[PDB]
Scaffold this active site. Structure first.
Site, mmCIF file in Angstrom:
data_model
loop_
_atom_site.group_PDB
_atom_site.id
_atom_site.type_symbol
_atom_site.label_atom_id
_atom_site.label_comp_id
_atom_site.label_asym_id
_atom_site.label_seq_id
_atom_site.Cartn_x
_atom_site.Cartn_y
_atom_site.Cartn_z
ATOM 1 N N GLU A 1 1.353 -0.846 -0.163
ATOM 2 C CA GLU A 1 0.018 0.206 -0.125
ATOM 3 C C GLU A 1 0.831 1.342 -0.134
ATOM 4 O OE1 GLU A 1 -2.729 0.907 3.792
ATOM 5 O OE2 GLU A 1 -1.805 -0.573 4.637
ATOM 6 N N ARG B 1 -4.195 -4.265 1.885
ATOM 7 C CA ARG B 1 -5.501 -3.519 2.079
ATOM 8 C C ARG B 1 -6.337 -2.991 0.661
ATOM 9 N NH1 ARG B 1 -2.933 -0.316 6.538
ATOM 10 N NH2 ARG B 1 -3.145 -1.383 8.962
ATOM 11 N N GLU C 1 7.111 5.537 15.329
ATOM 12 C CA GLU C 1 6.108 4.555 15.885
ATOM 13 C C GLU C 1 6.188 3.630 16.988
ATOM 14 O OE1 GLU C 1 5.570 1.173 12.477
ATOM 15 O OE2 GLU C 1 4.563 3.183 11.332
HETATM 16 C C1 LIG Z 1 -1.310 12.604 16.916
HETATM 17 O O1 LIG Z 1 -2.769 11.900 16.284
HETATM 18 C C2 LIG Z 1 -2.630 11.323 15.203
HETATM 19 C C3 LIG Z 1 -1.220 11.180 14.425
HETATM 20 C C4 LIG Z 1 -0.375 10.205 13.581
HETATM 21 C C5 LIG Z 1 -2.752 9.198 12.863
HETATM 22 C C6 LIG Z 1 -1.861 8.932 11.881
HETATM 23 N N1 LIG Z 1 -3.086 8.002 11.697
HETATM 24 C C7 LIG Z 1 -2.044 6.976 10.286
HETATM 25 C C8 LIG Z 1 -3.223 5.866 9.617
HETATM 26 C C9 LIG Z 1 -3.490 4.461 10.399
HETATM 27 S S1 LIG Z 1 -4.525 6.613 8.659
HETATM 28 C C10 LIG Z 1 -4.413 5.745 7.330
HETATM 29 N N2 LIG Z 1 -3.154 4.670 7.096
HETATM 30 C C11 LIG Z 1 -3.172 3.764 5.456
HETATM 31 N N3 LIG Z 1 -2.805 2.879 5.826
HETATM 32 C C12 LIG Z 1 -5.041 4.625 5.123
HETATM 33 C C13 LIG Z 1 -5.048 5.080 4.795
HETATM 34 N N4 LIG Z 1 -6.267 5.790 4.206
HETATM 35 N N5 LIG Z 1 -4.977 5.385 6.119
HETATM 36 C C14 LIG Z 1 -1.220 7.557 10.199
HETATM 37 C C15 LIG Z 1 -0.484 7.301 8.669
HETATM 38 S S2 LIG Z 1 -0.648 8.794 11.474
HETATM 39 C C16 LIG Z 1 -3.367 9.969 13.662
HETATM 40 C C17 LIG Z 1 -3.848 10.484 14.791
HETATM 41 O O2 LIG Z 1 -4.484 11.046 15.696
HETATM 42 C C18 LIG Z 1 -5.584 10.263 15.861
HETATM 43 C C19 LIG Z 1 -6.654 11.094 16.312
HETATM 44 F F1 LIG Z 1 -7.620 10.322 16.223
HETATM 45 C C1 LIG Z 2 -3.884 9.474 19.321
HETATM 46 O O1 LIG Z 2 -2.680 9.734 18.746
HETATM 47 C C2 LIG Z 2 -1.867 9.098 17.631
HETATM 48 C C3 LIG Z 2 -2.806 7.623 17.024
HETATM 49 C C4 LIG Z 2 -2.188 7.357 15.737
HETATM 50 C C5 LIG Z 2 -1.337 7.334 16.051
HETATM 51 C C6 LIG Z 2 -0.664 6.771 14.529
HETATM 52 N N1 LIG Z 2 1.100 6.786 13.714
HETATM 53 C C7 LIG Z 2 1.467 6.110 13.725
HETATM 54 C C8 LIG Z 2 2.984 6.567 12.566
HETATM 55 C C9 LIG Z 2 3.965 7.036 13.863
HETATM 56 S S1 LIG Z 2 2.337 7.711 11.259
HETATM 57 C C10 LIG Z 2 4.482 7.224 10.775
HETATM 58 N N2 LIG Z 2 4.775 6.031 10.896
HETATM 59 C C11 LIG Z 2 6.231 6.135 9.816
HETATM 60 N N3 LIG Z 2 6.700 4.590 9.849
HETATM 61 C C12 LIG Z 2 6.411 6.699 9.705
HETATM 62 C C13 LIG Z 2 5.867 8.639 9.777
HETATM 63 N N4 LIG Z 2 6.615 9.363 8.801
HETATM 64 N N5 LIG Z 2 5.239 8.636 10.025
HETATM 65 C C14 LIG Z 2 0.526 5.825 12.610
HETATM 66 C C15 LIG Z 2 0.697 4.601 11.451
HETATM 67 S S2 LIG Z 2 -0.890 5.623 13.540
HETATM 68 C C16 LIG Z 2 0.030 8.182 16.653
HETATM 69 C C17 LIG Z 2 -0.647 9.270 17.525
HETATM 70 O O2 LIG Z 2 -0.037 9.699 18.424
HETATM 71 C C18 LIG Z 2 1.660 8.985 19.437
HETATM 72 C C19 LIG Z 2 2.712 9.347 19.404
HETATM 73 F F1 LIG Z 2 1.943 11.053 19.180
#
Ligand SMILES: COc1ccc(-c2nc([C@@H](C)Sc3nc(N)cc(N)n3)c(C)s2)cc1OCCF
Ligand SMILES: COc1ccc(-c2nc([C@H](C)Sc3nc(N)cc(N)n3)c(C)s2)cc1OCCF
Ligand SMILES: COc1ccc(-c2nc([C@@H](C)Sc3nc(N)cc(N)n3)c(C)s2)cc1OCCF
Ligand SMILES: COc1ccc(-c2nc([C@H](C)Sc3nc(N)cc(N)n3)c(C)s2)cc1OCCF
Ligand SMILES: O=c1ccn([C@@H]2O[C@H](COP(=O)(O)OP(=O)(O)O)[C@@H](O)[C@H]2O)c(=O)[nH]1
Ligand SMILES: O=c1ccn([C@@H]2O[C@H](COP(=O)(O)OP(=O)(O)O)[C@@H](O)[C@H]2O)c(=O)[nH]1
Lengths: 231, 231
Positions: A34, A99, A168
């Protein structure tokens, strides 16, 4: 006549590990990582992909719409490229998607809305942009089946802990828990309705992947092969 | 076999006025009004539109990317729906589109990037998609000609008055001046290097609409007729 099958599951469930095992077992089987996974770590897309990944992490309430739209768009392009470019010289061709556009909307986007990171308008525009944009361009991305890789939030958490990526380590268990529930309702319980009536009847295979399958996957691959014969 | 003509023009140059005039002159002549014009006075599209239009105005650096993607999606659908549903029994069918997917990107979206209402990632993402939305969906919408209703920015500002929308009295001449120059570069000097190759050779008819034409439009229509006979 190419069979399209989506590999679903939570973060750190083992989808990359699984598809990386599957691809080497047959010449008739291909795989599509993906794009969000490719963004995580250069083309026009990979640059925008990196930036929006970071922006989303740094402020999800600002970037969840931008990111979801681009992520889905990129997936459709990555998938259509594989349909038209691959497996022409195969007698039993299978294309394994990491996915799906359904995951994009009904798991990730849906969760961001419910987390208030998208407002009503954004979620409403996104669904329209998704309903329309798939029911032609990605019309015949219709899947022949879904393989559900089920792991508990703790396993996934440990596999994030085990994967060891610095970025992460902070993903919180609560979020994983949130994603787990959305998968169960779509794939296991089947309560979640969608705007894609065929998905109400598309065959799913659940595999339980809590136990490490890296050195020991034959029962799982046996299950896949058996599932493919029923399609 | 429907000829496709875009009417292009700055805010209040007189495009609505013109198209409605043109629609009455032949049962073979029909018009596709532009989505944003609809929103500026109901369906999920209208509600989404009215909301995104209001937020755009309030905070363009937050909502430009979203607005622009939904504006263009919406336009693409309309111009599809109009090709399908209009002028079925016409001998010499012509559809006049109020603006095009090209003014969407190269006038509006570009201006919003240039005025720091989209960042680079927003803009490159937009351009990335635009390229693909058209390629996958928008093939049949490619233009046979363009009509540029060319007016001074002073003219248009005056015309905003006559139209009497309280909302619109805040539009500054410096904004109109930026939109004007982009219209000129695109459609007069033909400087703008669009990515879409066939546009370099698309016929352009440029109509000085600085004089009032509501009740004195015969001569403009005569040029349209000559132009249309050459396509
Ligand atoms: C500080 O809060 C966050 C930090 C990161 C996220 C992220 N979620 C994601 C994915 C789980 S969303 C996603 N992933 C995919 N692989 C595909 C798609 N359509 N959407 C990230 C890549 S980053 C989400 C966060 O907040 C959720 C708040 F509820
Ligand atoms: C409610 O708080 C969060 C909810 C979801 C996340 C997520 N972070 C991630 C990654 C850390 S985003 C990411 N992953 C990577 N491997 C690289 C990159 N540049 N960014 C997810 C796939 S879901 C991270 C969250 O915050 C925790 C730290 F801030
Ligand atoms: C305070 O700053 C702004 C206030 C309002 C605007 C707006 N531009 C517009 C349109 C001209 S953008 C547009 N219009 C269309 N008709 C079509 C399309 N694709 N895009 C609004 C409806 S509101 C744009 C603003 O910033 C201009 C930055 F370049
Ligand atoms: C740089 O400053 C501006 C740039 C653009 C505008 C614009 N406003 C508008 C309209 C007033 S937006 C609009 N028009 C309508 N007729 C209805 C509605 N809900 N919204 C444009 C079409 S362009 C307005 C601007 O300044 C407003 C001062 F507050
Ligand atoms: O049975 C398994 C499945 C996965 N992993 C590891 O746990 C992490 C999560 O797996 P993967 O990256 O494939 O998960 P995805 O996020 O793609 O679902 C990876 O570093 C894998 O090497 C493992 O040790 N045993
Ligand atoms: O030849 C004209 C063209 C326009 N108008 C007026 O200028 C305003 C803007 O017209 P229109 O809605 O056609 O502008 P556009 O569709 O280009 O935004 C309206 O009050 C028109 O009645 C006019 O008096 N004479």
């Amino acid at each position: 006549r190419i069979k399209k099958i989506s590999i679903e599951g939570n973060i750190a469930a083992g989808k990359s590990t699984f598809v990386n095992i599957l691809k080497q077992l047959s010449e008739d089987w291909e795989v599509v990582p993906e794009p969000v996974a490719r963004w995580s770590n250069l083309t026009m897309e990979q640059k925008n992909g990196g930036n929006v990944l970071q922006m989303m992490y740094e402020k999800p309430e600002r970037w969840s719409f931008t990111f979801q739209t681009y992520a889905c768009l990129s997936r459709i392009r990555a998938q259509l490229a594989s349909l038209n470019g691959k497996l022409k010289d195969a007698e039993k061709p299978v294309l394994f998607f990491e996915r799906s556009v359904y995951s994009d909307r009904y798991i990730f986007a849906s969760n961001l809305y419910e987390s208030e990171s998208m407002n009503e308008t954004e979620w409403t525009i996104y669904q329209d942009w998704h309903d329309w944009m798939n029911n032609q361009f990605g019309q015949s991305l219709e899947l022949d089946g879904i393989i559900y890789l089920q792991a508990t939030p703790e396993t996934c958490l440990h596999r994030i802990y085990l994967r060891g990526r610095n970025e992460e380590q902070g993903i919180p268990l609560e979020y994983l828990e949130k994603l787990h529930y959305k998968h169960e309702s779509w794939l296991l319980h089947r309560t979640l309705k969608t705007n894609f009536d065929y998905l109400q009847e598309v065959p799913i295979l659940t595999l339980d992947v809590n136990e490490d399958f890296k050195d020991k996957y034959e029962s799982l691959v046996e299950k896949v092969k058996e599932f493919l014969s029923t399609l």
